[PDB]
Amino acid sequence: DLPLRFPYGRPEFLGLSQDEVEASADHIARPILILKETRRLPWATGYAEVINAGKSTHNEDQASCEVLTVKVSCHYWSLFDGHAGSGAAVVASRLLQHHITEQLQDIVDILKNEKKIPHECLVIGALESAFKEMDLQIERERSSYNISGGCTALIVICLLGKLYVANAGDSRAIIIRNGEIIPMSSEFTPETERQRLQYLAFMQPHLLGNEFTHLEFPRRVQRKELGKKMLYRDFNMTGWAYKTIEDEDLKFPLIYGEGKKARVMATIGVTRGLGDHDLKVHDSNIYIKPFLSSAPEVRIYDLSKYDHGSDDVLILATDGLWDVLSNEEVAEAITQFLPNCDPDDPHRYTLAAQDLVMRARGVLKDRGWRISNDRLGSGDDISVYVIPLIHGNK
Amino acid sequence: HMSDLPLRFPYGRPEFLGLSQDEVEASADHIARPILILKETRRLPWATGYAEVINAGKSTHNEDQASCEVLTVKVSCHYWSLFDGHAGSGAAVVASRLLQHHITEQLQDIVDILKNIPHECLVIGALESAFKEMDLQIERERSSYNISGGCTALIVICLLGKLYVANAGDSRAIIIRNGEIIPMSSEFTPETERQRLQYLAFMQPHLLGNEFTHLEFPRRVQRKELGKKMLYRDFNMTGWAYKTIEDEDLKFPLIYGEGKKARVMATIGVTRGLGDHDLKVHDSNIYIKPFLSSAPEVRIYDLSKYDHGSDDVLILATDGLWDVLSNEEVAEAITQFLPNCDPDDPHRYTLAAQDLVMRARGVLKDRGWRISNDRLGSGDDISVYVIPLIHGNKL
Ligand SMILES: [Mg+2]
Ligand SMILES: [Mg+2]
Ligand SMILES: [Mg+2]
Ligand SMILES: [Mg+2]
């Protein structure tokens, strides 16, 4: 009905032209696109991506990477895993950096120059406000532009010799530094956020629409067990204890499923990010957005405290990577791939990124996408940054 | 009112001290501040050490309470507990007598699973429910008995070779194992709980009674700054950003202060525990209890992954100790003291407990109580358990 805020596409730094773009969206070939060696990114950052194995017509991942000027320079990398549409992810790929820039400008003069407030806390609050302000802008432009769906957001900035990794979703950032894995992010899923979700449904039961219960049970409760004792978990418990099933325990659980496929209100499997303002429950007028948050967790890495080698890297990747490769596998692939490349070859990290995507996507024969050890490959969109920390050395 | 009701229990010191009430009287001296230790004639489970000392004058009674016994689930469950009472001794006395019965009963619900979802998660759950049920019982009995004030609750059980440390308050548990400090709990303060507190006030603004705002500011906002930009911090923020000050920012902050002066609606400086069901904001009608919680955090230490020594101890203490002694000073004091008593001396850990209390309490000057390096001594009630992990070893 309404116009697109921006045309759909792939990251601008891939310099694709719209016929290249549609050769990319091949669900059976799944071509791995990489940054052309002729186009260098900040810090010679490597990038690689690939479309899902069928579940959405378009690659709903997006990514932006550039050097911001704050009136000081600020390096920037972003990944947005869109869902239920490409809209939010494209909008955030273009506009979040503007919000980050505006928030940093409020505080840039404190940075170059009664609760005591460290300067990092100002930078963190600028990122925190920037995510909040990117939402809101999506919220208010919903009714004028077709900004479909929702997206997670994972961004990194390098400001004054520190990395700030700010995550609101289930993408993941890790540093691989001389083989050790430094996690720079945590995921926001119905699993990791259960207590927050439960407590909010408890404090505001009208958000459940008399269709869900905020209590969590080992398996689905059917009227079969009404009046029997059963294990339950409330927002205040990490553990389990017994309760007599008392009618309302019959409703669909607010949190259901195990692990990576736990879902809030039978609908969404990630609890933070942007968009999803009008997202409702399957065939229902219950809104999901009260339960989601745009608020990112922000972690800091001081680049000045370590002399990083050619192989010490920050990996940014959407769940498409991490859904099949552990942190340890990614570290093993990185540390085994990069020593085979000339350390002064600017393409190194793109090829490392291509290696990671390859190892998560796999090869399609007749048994579906398989990676190493005959494991199912990832059928999701996969986007990978490989950021060489050697260019952040003081 | 509660003042018209009889006491649920008479005031006393921990039962296991076997103090006659002449001895109890002798112990509530605020000038000599006598350090009470466990009589060698009364052994505690695991030869557990215990020492305590009354506050320097800020309340007529020692408002700490402590309970130590071997419970039986119908299996054996060792139980140590500290309650830092406030605004009265009633909650802490009641909790020191009745929380164990809630624990026993919640454990009975899962005892058959234990000796025949991970099992730890069931023990954890029982503790979390027991705390909720010890509150609630206080909440109902409130109407028939004078269960004054509130208290924090730090408890430890040993069940089937694991220690569960359930903390709701600002007492602290640490293991000192071969000189290293293994933290077994986190305090629940207006600072550590800021975002929970702010978000609850955001969700339920009626809890502020139009006297408070949920936003935090680097200092108290003055009316003079209406319309100007100021750093603020909201519930979803760890950092600070700018905002224009808008009338509602002039209300008194929900969280204001730093360290132990940090307070919630200018009334309470600890945010978890039992009791306080009728606690109200300083001169007013705003109830504090909606922001309080009885839910402990539970941490597990597996007593089989390590063959513990004579000097490997779990230290439980109320903030009377941790307010003037850091974890490392406590570790310094344990590792310096315990090597100097016969390993087979059953009074070993009570003496270490006493030494900890004494190192926190200090000596009396014309200026007040001072510890080492002319530092100010603790003026609070101090209660310390030294629990020797050697008694938790395999087999
Ligand atoms: Mg997606
Ligand atoms: Mg994905
Ligand atoms: Mg007290
Ligand atoms: Mg105290």
Numbering used by the authors:
A (entry chain B): 34 to 104, 142 to 183, 232 to 512
B (entry chain A): 31 to 104, 142 to 183, 235 to 513
According to the publication:
Cellular assays, crosslinking and 3‐D modelling suggest that the flap domain encodes the docking motif for phosphorylated Rabs. Therefore, PPM1H has acquired a Rab‐specific interaction domain within a conserved phosphatase fold.
To grow WT crystals and improve diffraction, a “loop deletion” variant of PPM1H (PPM1H‐LD) was designed to eliminate a flexible and non‐conserved loop (188‐226) that was predicted to be distant from the active site. The 2.5 Å model of PPM1HWT‐LD will be used for ensuing discussions, except for 3‐D docking analyses with model substrates in which we used the MnPPM1HWT‐LD variant. The structure of PPM1H adopts a conserved PPM fold consisting of 10 β‐strands organized into a 5 × 5 β‐sandwich. The active site cleft is formed by loops, including a short α‐helical loop (α4, residues 443–447), that connect β‐strands on one edge of the β‐sandwich. M1 is coordinated by D437 and D498, while D151 coordinates both metal sites. The metal binding includes water molecules, and the geometry is approximately octahedral for both metal sites (M1 and M2). Using size exclusion chromatography coupled to multi‐angle light scattering (SEC‐MALS), we showed that PPM1HWT‐LD is a dimer.
